[PDB]
DNA sequence: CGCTGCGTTTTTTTTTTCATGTGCCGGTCTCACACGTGCCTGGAGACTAGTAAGCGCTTCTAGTGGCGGTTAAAACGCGGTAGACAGCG
């Protein structure tokens, strides 16, 4: 029982959610507490995670500013 | 393997029909406005009379300046933070 990496955590429920605008931080918060385990802060630390992702170019962004819009995956 | 573009399939947006409720015209029927008539009460006349109120005069209050002094209170401005407003699901 552990929360593997930000991104090692993300990347699994990103993953089983095919979406055209992709997926928003609601929907993957929502997966990770049903399946996966964790106590709490989790949706600050997603929030992070999701930007260091946007910053450098991991995961884009489909529409929205901060930890607001949508996140899909790498390619 | 990774990309790249380019025909595909779908989505967004435009244009044209289309089925809907609108308010618009012109003929029938109803009971409500308007008239009227006749009776009765409440307004008018007029004069009486008694008292309220308005004007001037008497006083004296309580309202309007005005004079500085000290202080508490406004002013102003700078600095940052949390709350207002938009945008996403
Ligand atoms: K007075």
């Keep these: 029982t552990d929360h593997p ?3 090692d955590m993300i990347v ?3 993953q089983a959610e095919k979406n055209r605008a992709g997926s928003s931080r ?5 997966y990770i507490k049903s399946h996966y ?3 709490e802060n ?6 992070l ?4 992702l946007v910053t450098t170019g991991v995961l884009k962004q489909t529409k929205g500013v901060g930890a607001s ?7």
């Design 5 to 7: 990496k930000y991104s």
């Design 69 to 75: 819009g949508s996140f899909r995956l790498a390619k």
């Design 12 to 14: 699994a429920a990103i």
């Design 37 to 39: 385990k964790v106590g």
């Design 26 to 30: 609601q929907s993957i918060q929502k």
């Design 42 to 47: 989790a949706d600050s630390q997603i929030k």
């Design 49 to 52: 995670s999701i930007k260091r």
